[PDB]
Design a binder for these strands. Structure first.
Ligand SMILES: [Mg+2]
Ligand SMILES: [Mg+2]
Ligand SMILES: [Mg+2]
Ligand SMILES: [Mg+2]
Ligand SMILES: [Mg+2]
Ligand SMILES: [Mg+2]
Ligand SMILES: [Mg+2]
Ligand SMILES: [Mg+2]
Ligand SMILES: [Mg+2]
Ligand SMILES: [Mg+2]
Ligand SMILES: [Mg+2]
Ligand SMILES: [Mg+2]
Ligand SMILES: [Mg+2]
Ligand SMILES: [Mg+2]
Ligand SMILES: [Mg+2]
Ligand SMILES: [Mg+2]
Ligand SMILES: [Mg+2]
Ligand SMILES: [Mg+2]
Ligand SMILES: [Mg+2]
Ligand SMILES: [Mg+2]
Ligand SMILES: [Mg+2]
Ligand SMILES: [Mg+2]
Ligand SMILES: [Mg+2]
Ligand SMILES: [Mg+2]
Ligand SMILES: [Mg+2]
Ligand SMILES: [Mg+2]
Ligand SMILES: [Zn+2]
Lengths: 99, 129, 150, 24, 139
RNA sequence: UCCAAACUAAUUU
RNA sequence: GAAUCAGGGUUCGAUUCCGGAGAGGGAGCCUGAGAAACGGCUACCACAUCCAAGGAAGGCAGCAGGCGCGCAAAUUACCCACUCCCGACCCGGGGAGGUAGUGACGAAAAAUAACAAUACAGGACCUGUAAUUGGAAUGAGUCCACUUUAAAUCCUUUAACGAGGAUCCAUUGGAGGGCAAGUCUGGUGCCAGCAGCCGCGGUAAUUCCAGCUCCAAUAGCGUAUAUUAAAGUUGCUGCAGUUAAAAAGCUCGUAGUUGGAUCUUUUUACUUUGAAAAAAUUAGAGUGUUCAAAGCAGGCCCGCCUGGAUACCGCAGCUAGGAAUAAUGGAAUAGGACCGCGUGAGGCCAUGAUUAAGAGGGACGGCCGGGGGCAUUCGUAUUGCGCCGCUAGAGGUGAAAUUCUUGGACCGGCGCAAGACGGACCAGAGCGAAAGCAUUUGCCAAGAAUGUUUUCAUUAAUCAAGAACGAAAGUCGGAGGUUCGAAGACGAUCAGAUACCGUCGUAGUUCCGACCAUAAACGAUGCCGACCGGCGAUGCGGCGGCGUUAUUGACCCGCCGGGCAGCUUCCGGGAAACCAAAGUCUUUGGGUUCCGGGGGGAGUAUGGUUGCAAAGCUGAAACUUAAAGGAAUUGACGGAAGGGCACCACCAGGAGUGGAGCCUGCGGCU
């Protein structure tokens, strides 16, 4: 039987979307199917921010960011616990988890 | 495309009946529909209907009393002799007590009880009950 | 819907109810017919004659002023084209695609649209042959059609 | 048996029958 | 759906005549291949000659030995297997003995727990096997 | 993200 | 015509009536009004009969009969008396026909007990039960006679006999469930056996073999096979096709099928009626064959009266009414009706062209789009290479090793080269018939939607045959080869590992030109059309509206139309999951195309066809099997995820046991 109303992907008005590669194992995934995760993790690891900033040659130096857009196949995103399985009524819910 | 105007008229009257609406638009008005509605109106299932003339095939607004169960059409318009008419009666009508099969005979568009009186057959248009 | 497209678009004209000529149009039926005689001398098809009269003269419909359609007025005087205008424009379109297809012959989309356009030509010439507009021996050859248009 | 490979075995068998009848 | 128009009788009659072939009871009663394949040849009974007494093992979960005979027909020379129905009616039959066989219930299909057997013996040497069983007649 | 295969013919609820 | 049958149907019709055909196979003929005759000739083939071997004669698919074939079918009987036929005929002849025999093909009728008293049981004076008793009634059978009939026989009639265990004896199938009827008794012990189907039987068998009881239908009843209903499991009425079997990859397209509105409120189709239609059969009228199946008879006191009906008989053809529906036809180069008048000159017709589809084609307008083709430009990256710098490791994995490195690997810097690829932006957004489509710019042709008081005037919808397109892989030519990488070679892992993981690496991946025609080519959902709830968005076009902002755009608030979607709903539907379509379906009919019929065998075999090949298309059967399957529910389990817990679990430990001798328990041996 059919499990989701879209077929686990966001392809509605087109026939073929181009594929990307999973950043964890390089599986070919269509672009709309893949679990996208944009991370703006700081490059400093704030346990270390009070050591880099005291050792700087500046005083007001805002530390840069790191902009990585990760992609995942369904196999890797479950195994990395990016996503989880949900109940049957709780699948019908598209609001992202809060911050 | 639209091959049959009477079918789209009776399907729209039937859908508005079970929705409980009072009035309904019937798009293109032919004279066969007007002669079909009068037979429904003389036996009293529908109210007065207003015909709108717009210099092409017009529109008909029909008042619904709330009495109609099912107005259906029969496609194609099979020729029906008086010998075979009672076999159409127990395939279309829910009872021998009410309901009508509408024929188009040479003396005009008739219900089936009138065609027995006039002793003539014709092609079948539809039915209502 | 459309004949060779999956378009269901509605979008057409809508003539008003009263077909009486408006009072502000001070222009007789002869003065419109003479006007149509000159615009057709300039080589204009009957579709784009009614556009000029509508946009510049207030004549919303020729057949309400004069009682006759524009193509009936031209056929009565000999200013009618030999081919009908809508068949002329399907043939003129089928030349530009087939000239395009000489040079761009990997263009499989134009090869597809040329089949659709020419299928309309043969459905349309079937109609004008049974209405006795075109002669019954009239065929559409692709190799000789370029001289008939433009 | 994955029916994809049950087709593949049925190709290779039909492959083999064609050249048995070719040589006769 | 289906065509309903007033002149579509040929389309309806021919489509029906083609789609009749897709069920089993019409197909076997009109090809003639299955009529070619049963050894009765469209008959209800046949006389044959017992060649051999054969033991047929029952399909599981049943665990008995079904007593049958290997019979060659007189009509066409086809060799079949017929069941011998009752407690100990194999002892009434000998070899080279002329029997009468009939069908076994399911109109050509195999019946019960006997694999590949679709016939039973009726008369044994012009005497019905039900009479030898009940002691009505003697050989 | 180390390897991890198999399971009376001996039957009765 | 027959069987079945609600309405439709399905199957059968060798078979007594009508018509045809043939007389072992074919062929040729004579005679005659009529024959290509066969109870007529003539051949040849096949077969077969007598024979003195020289010859001669043959045709039972006529009645009987026999052989053979087989599951399968009657007496070498009597008669022209009836029915009729033929002849020269009131007289003769008829294996036509009639009558008997054989006849459980079948159909109709109908015995095998009834009563009374007791013995008893009951019920609110009535009834039941009895191997108790009682004489009353009859046929079966035997049997004179009549009758019957050609002579008989049978039935009908009537004497004579003819019943108590009224022995003058009712069988055939069953008893777990379907499905009416036993948890009785004895035997057997997964044996013998039953059982259509599910099943039963391995030592208390409700199922076998028997006895007892009981049930069913009864002079009938099982069994096999064809077939009809059941079967709305062939679906015209009436089926399905999202996931159960199934909608073709997509579009074009000829046949075919189907086609908008419009007018009095010529050819057809249709409808009604009339004829003409073989009886039998069917329906059905009348009628006490003793009833009934039947039959066409009969009935009423010299005779009389009276029946031997009517209907039905598809379609086609014929006939007269009807003129709605549905086709079709008349006047547009007037070559037109109508009147007059000399091939002319005229009048005259209100002179003659429906509408402009919330059908369609075409023009036009400003747009819009990862649509298409050609060219062009760019971007880092990767790989290689040079040169420089410093170095001893680099790489790779779960861990490793193959591999690469003092000859300088990797890392850094600058530079070059080549070939791919177009990130982020990029969305439940767009475009395309689908496959598919993303750097910049130019060129070429296309197209939807919107706008429109333009144009044509039904030009349309769906479509066998046919046609164009059709990812990937694959094929054949050229070119190119950076990355990746089937096959291949190694390194590991492993019981094995010709796999997963690593290191290399062919074809291929790239382009140009041909092929190939399939995909989970999926929304697993044909197309065209109509109607049927809301709501918030989105994309394009149009229109309107406070105000912001820039020098017609950008925002804002709505409205309209096409589009891709979402949420929500007891519209309704559905086996449900779910769907605003999968709704408007037993209240069953908008048009039309393709296609399914338990699972397997099998998309196999063969044949045809297409292709260079690989293969595509078309496509069985034998045989086999009682399920296979879909949806949902509860458990169980998961080398699935969340929570939580336990020294019969771990951690931190302690004491140990496992080693020794002995004690004692179990296996084994004896
Ligand atoms: Mg795809
Ligand atoms: Mg089309
Ligand atoms: Mg003859
Ligand atoms: Mg013979
Ligand atoms: Mg002869
Ligand atoms: Mg004879
Ligand atoms: Mg018989
Ligand atoms: Mg009987
Ligand atoms: Mg008796
Ligand atoms: Mg039973
Ligand atoms: Mg049936
Ligand atoms: Mg039925
Ligand atoms: Mg079905
Ligand atoms: Mg399926
Ligand atoms: Mg599809
Ligand atoms: Mg019409
Ligand atoms: Mg980019
Ligand atoms: Mg085709
Ligand atoms: Mg390809
Ligand atoms: Mg090559
Ligand atoms: Mg590997
Ligand atoms: Mg390739
Ligand atoms: Mg396919
Ligand atoms: Mg459906
Ligand atoms: Mg239906
Ligand atoms: Mg099947
Ligand atoms: Zn992955």
């Amino acid at each position: 039987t059919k499990k989701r109303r879209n077929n686990g992907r966001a392809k509605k008005g087109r026939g073929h979307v181009q594929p990307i590669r999973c950043t964890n194992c390089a599986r070919c995934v269509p672009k709309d199917k893949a679990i996208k995760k944009f991370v703006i993790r700081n490059i400093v690891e704030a346990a270390a921010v009070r050591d880099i900033s005291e050792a700087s040659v500046f005083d007001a130096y805002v530390l840069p960011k790191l902009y990585v857009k990760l992609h995942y196949c369904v196999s890797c995103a479950i195994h990395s616990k990016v996503v989880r399985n949900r109940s049957r009524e709780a699948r019908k819910d598209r609001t992202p988890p809060p911050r | 495309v639209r091959m049959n105007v009477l079918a789209d008229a009776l399907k729209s009257i039937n859908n508005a009946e079970k929705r409980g609406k009072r009035q309904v638009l019937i798009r293109p008005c032919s004279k066969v529909i007007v002669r079909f509605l009068t037979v429904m109106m003389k036996h009293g299932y529908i109210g007065e209907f207003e015909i709108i003339d717009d210099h092409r095939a017009g529109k008909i607004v029909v008042n619904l009393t709330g009495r109609l169960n099912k107005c259906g059409v029969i496609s194609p318009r099979f020729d029906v002799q008086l010998k075979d008419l009672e076999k159409w009666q127990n395939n279309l009508l829910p009872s021998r007590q009410f309901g009508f099969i509408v024929l188009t005979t040479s003396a005009g568009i008739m219900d089936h009880e009138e065609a027995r009186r006039k002793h003539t057959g014709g092609k079948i248009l539809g039915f209502f009950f | 819907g459309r004949m060779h497209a999956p378009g269901k678009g509605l979008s057409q004209s809508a003539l008003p109810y009263r077909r009486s000529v408006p009072t502000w149009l001070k222009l007789t039926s002869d003065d419109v017919k003479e006007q149509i005689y000159k615009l057709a001398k300039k080589g204009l098809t009957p579709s784009q004659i009614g556009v000029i009269l509508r946009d510049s003269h207030g004549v919303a419909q020729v057949r309400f002023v004069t009682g006759n359609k524009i193509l009936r007025i031209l056929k009565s005087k000999g200013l009618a084209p030999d081919l009908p205008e809508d068949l002329y424009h399907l043939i003129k379109k089928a030349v530009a695609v087939r000239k395009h297809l000489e040079r761009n012959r990997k263009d499989k989309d134009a090869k597809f649209r040329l089949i659709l356009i020419e299928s309309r030509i043969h459905r349309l010439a079937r109609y004008y042959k049974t209405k006795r507009v075109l002669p019954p021996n009239w065929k559409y050859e692709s190799s000789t059609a370029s001289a008939l248009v433009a | 048996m994955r029916a994809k490979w049950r087709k593949k075995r049925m190709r290779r068998l039909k492959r083999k029958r064609r050249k048995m009848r070719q040589r006769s | 759906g289906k065509c309903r128009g007033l002149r579509t009788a040929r389309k309806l009659r021919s489509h029906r005549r083609d789609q009749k072939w897709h069920d089993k009871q019409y197909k076997k009663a009109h090809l003639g291949t299955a009529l070619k394949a049963n050894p009765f040849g469209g008959a209800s009974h046949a006389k044959g000659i017992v060649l051999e007494k054969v033991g047929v093992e029952a399909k599981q979960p049943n665990s008995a030995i079904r007593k049958c005979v290997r019979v060659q027909l007189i009509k066409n020379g086809k060799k079949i297997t017929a069941f011998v129905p009752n407690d100990g009616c194999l002892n009434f039959i000998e070899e080279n003995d002329e029997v009468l066989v009939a069908g076994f219930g399911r109109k050509g299909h195999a019946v019960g727990d006997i694999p590949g057997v679709r016939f039973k013996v009726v008369k044994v040497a012009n005497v019905s096997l039900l009479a030898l069983y009940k002691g009505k007649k003697e050989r």
